[PDB]
Design an enzyme around this catalytic site. Structure first.
Site, PDB file in Angstrom:
ATOM      1  N   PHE A  44      13.707  11.381  -3.244  1.00 33.41           N
ATOM      2  CA  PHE A  44      13.136  11.377  -2.769  1.00 33.41           C
ATOM      3  C   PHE A  44      12.752  12.581  -1.953  1.00 33.41           C
ATOM      4  O   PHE A  44      13.198  13.634  -2.157  1.00 33.41           O
ATOM      5  CB  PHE A  44      14.047  11.072  -1.345  1.00 33.41           C
ATOM      6  CG  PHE A  44      14.492  10.543  -0.072  1.00 33.41           C
ATOM      7  CD1 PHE A  44      14.673  10.991   0.650  1.00 33.41           C
ATOM      8  CD2 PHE A  44      14.064   9.164   0.538  1.00 33.41           C
ATOM      9  CE1 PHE A  44      13.968  11.286   2.355  1.00 33.41           C
ATOM     10  CE2 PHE A  44      13.513   9.396   2.295  1.00 33.41           C
ATOM     11  CZ  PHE A  44      13.248  10.606   2.835  1.00 33.41           C
TER      12      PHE A  44
ATOM     13  N   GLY B 105       4.572  -0.325  -0.521  1.00 30.48           N
ATOM     14  CA  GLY B 105       3.974   0.012  -1.174  1.00 30.48           C
ATOM     15  C   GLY B 105       2.883  -0.032  -2.257  1.00 30.48           C
ATOM     16  O   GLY B 105       2.534  -1.437  -1.450  1.00 30.48           O
TER      17      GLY B 105
ATOM     18  N   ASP C 110       3.654   8.705  -7.974  1.00 33.02           N
ATOM     19  CA  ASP C 110       3.477   7.918  -8.477  1.00 33.02           C
ATOM     20  C   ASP C 110       2.110   7.454  -9.754  1.00 33.02           C
ATOM     21  O   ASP C 110       1.423   7.259  -9.965  1.00 33.02           O
ATOM     22  CB  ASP C 110       2.934   6.004  -7.791  1.00 33.02           C
ATOM     23  CG  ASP C 110       3.308   5.838  -6.431  1.00 33.02           C
ATOM     24  OD1 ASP C 110       4.122   6.034  -6.676  1.00 33.02           O
ATOM     25  OD2 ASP C 110       3.162   6.007  -5.414  1.00 33.02           O
TER      26      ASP C 110
ATOM     27  N   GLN D 246      -1.199   9.632   1.260  1.00 30.13           N
ATOM     28  CA  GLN D 246       0.139   9.017   1.444  1.00 30.13           C
ATOM     29  C   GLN D 246       1.254   9.215  -0.043  1.00 30.13           C
ATOM     30  O   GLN D 246       2.597   8.969   0.511  1.00 30.13           O
ATOM     31  CB  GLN D 246      -0.325   7.347   1.496  1.00 30.13           C
ATOM     32  CG  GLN D 246       0.133   7.438   2.338  1.00 30.13           C
ATOM     33  CD  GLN D 246       0.209   5.918   3.450  1.00 30.13           C
ATOM     34  OE1 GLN D 246      -0.917   5.026   3.284  1.00 30.13           O
ATOM     35  NE2 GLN D 246       0.800   5.662   4.587  1.00 30.13           N
ATOM     36  N   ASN D 247       1.065   9.620  -0.467  1.00 35.30           N
ATOM     37  CA  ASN D 247       1.602   9.438  -2.337  1.00 35.30           C
ATOM     38  C   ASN D 247       1.362  11.187  -1.941  1.00 35.30           C
ATOM     39  O   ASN D 247       2.141  11.566  -3.555  1.00 35.30           O
ATOM     40  CB  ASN D 247       1.274   8.604  -3.394  1.00 35.30           C
ATOM     41  CG  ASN D 247      -0.064   8.861  -3.782  1.00 35.30           C
ATOM     42  OD1 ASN D 247      -0.415   9.751  -4.221  1.00 35.30           O
ATOM     43  ND2 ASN D 247      -0.651   7.416  -4.504  1.00 35.30           N
TER      44      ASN D 247
ATOM     45  N   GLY E 129       4.785  -3.119  -4.305  1.00 35.92           N
ATOM     46  CA  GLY E 129       5.799  -3.736  -3.336  1.00 35.92           C
ATOM     47  C   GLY E 129       7.113  -3.105  -1.935  1.00 35.92           C
ATOM     48  O   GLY E 129       6.006  -1.782  -2.255  1.00 35.92           O
TER      49      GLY E 129
ATOM     50  N   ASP F  82      -5.070   7.015  -8.534  1.00 30.10           N
ATOM     51  CA  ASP F  82      -4.645   6.779  -6.943  1.00 30.10           C
ATOM     52  C   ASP F  82      -4.281   7.729  -6.168  1.00 30.10           C
ATOM     53  O   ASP F  82      -3.551   6.996  -4.657  1.00 30.10           O
ATOM     54  CB  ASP F  82      -4.549   5.166  -6.884  1.00 30.10           C
ATOM     55  CG  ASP F  82      -4.491   4.530  -5.141  1.00 30.10           C
ATOM     56  OD1 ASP F  82      -5.491   4.835  -4.778  1.00 30.10           O
ATOM     57  OD2 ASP F  82      -3.306   3.782  -5.261  1.00 30.10           O
TER      58      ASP F  82
ATOM     59  N   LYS G  32      -4.287  10.389  -3.310  1.00 31.57           N
ATOM     60  CA  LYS G  32      -4.025   9.458  -1.725  1.00 31.57           C
ATOM     61  C   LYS G  32      -3.070  10.432  -0.618  1.00 31.57           C
ATOM     62  O   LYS G  32      -2.318  11.041  -1.364  1.00 31.57           O
ATOM     63  CB  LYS G  32      -4.418   8.185  -1.228  1.00 31.57           C
ATOM     64  CG  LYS G  32      -3.231   7.215  -1.600  1.00 31.57           C
ATOM     65  CD  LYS G  32      -3.927   5.841  -1.488  1.00 31.57           C
ATOM     66  CE  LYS G  32      -2.706   5.201  -2.122  1.00 31.57           C
ATOM     67  NZ  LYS G  32      -3.195   4.435  -1.562  1.00 31.57           N
TER      68      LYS G  32
END
Ligand SMILES: NCc1ccc(CNc2ccc([N+](=O)[O-])cc2C(N)=O)cc1
Length: 282
Positions: free
Chosen positions: A74, A13, A137, A123-124, A16, A119, A121
């Protein structure tokens, strides 16, 4: 964390390492992020109340041994992977439409609570087998901040504006909508200036007419090349006029003219929205 069994490393991430983990006591399967500030703690803690079906739930904020862990709901796949998997045939329009509609519902909810993502995108954006898509996020950027993908960054951020508005999320989502449709990133810049110039080459170099105040932005330079705006039918073919119309409103240069999530939900493009079941191979 002796309370979680690491099942797998699902990523590196922005803050982290992230692991798929199982809660030894509850059996619950979660995404555990190890974050690498009391202001951050209180702020993050506020996000635990930001619950919506299209927002990945923040289950817990664990501050122990002077370390910070975020435990999240999840989901099995992200949109970046789904788009790659659907690259040969493309994501069917009905599903693109369903996903966009759901993401706008999530944005409308967060924005109504004064929470920005900043942010967004592929991927999130996480998906499941039920046809749901959720934003991951939200609010983390403001809670923290300070290779990073610039592809979905709004122009006002690239021009150095210090105060972001809800409009930055609408811009990113428009870029994602275009990518789902064409199967290619809309503005794949590889540096801040390449990102800015790629936007200018497609939408035209902004000026005071279309974006009042742009020439006074922190990083604006009169020396920017002046490119003419491209015909919108060439940018996301073969998307229909309802789709192009909505996209154009999501990509307006002036943050204040950019359509809101709430207003976008009412756009004629969604007249026939449905909720199809995606084909997910897990
Ligand atoms: N085949 C591994 C795999 C498992 C899960 C996912 C999608 N899911 C996530 C990806 C990243 C992250 N992340 O925090 O960086 C979280 C999740 C989350 N909440 O489930 C993608 C790939």
């Amino acid at each position: 964390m002796e309370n979680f069994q690491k099942v797998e490393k699902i990523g590196e991430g922005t803050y982290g390492v992230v692991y798929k983990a199982r809660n030894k006591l509850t059996g619950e399967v979660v995404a555990l992020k190890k974050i690498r500030p009391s202001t951050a703690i209180r702020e993050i803690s506020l996000l635990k109340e930001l619950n919506h079906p299209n927002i990945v739930k923040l289950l817990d904020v664990i501050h122990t041994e002077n370390k910070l862990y975020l435990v999240f709901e999840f989901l099995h796949q992200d949109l970046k992977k789904f788009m790659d998997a659907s690259a040969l045939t493309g994501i069917p329009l009905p599903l693109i439409k369903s996903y966009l509609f759901q993401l706008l519902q999530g944005l409308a909810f967060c924005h109504s609570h004064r929470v920005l993502h900043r942010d967004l995108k592929p991927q999130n954006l996480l998906i499941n087998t039920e046809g749901a898509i959720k934003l991951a996020d939200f609010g983390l950027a403001r809670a923290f901040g300070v290779v990073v993908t610039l592809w979905y960054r709004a122009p006002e951020i690239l021009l150095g504006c210090k105060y972001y508005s809800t409009a930055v999320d609408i811009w990113s989502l428009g870029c994602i909508f275009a990518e789902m449709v064409t199967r290619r990133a809309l503005f794949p810049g590889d540096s801040e200036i390449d990102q800015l110039f790629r936007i200018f080459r497609t939408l035209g170099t902004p000026d005071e007419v279309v974006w009042p105040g742009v020439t006074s932005m922190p990083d604006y330079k009169p020396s920017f090349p002046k490119w003419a705006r491209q015909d919108f039918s060439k940018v996301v073919p073969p998307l229909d006029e309802d789709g192009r119309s909505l996209l154009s409103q999501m990509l307006h240069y002036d943050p204040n003219k950019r359509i809101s999530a709430k207003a976008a939900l009412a756009h004629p493009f969604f007249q026939d929205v449905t909720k199809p079941v995606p084909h997910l191979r897990l």
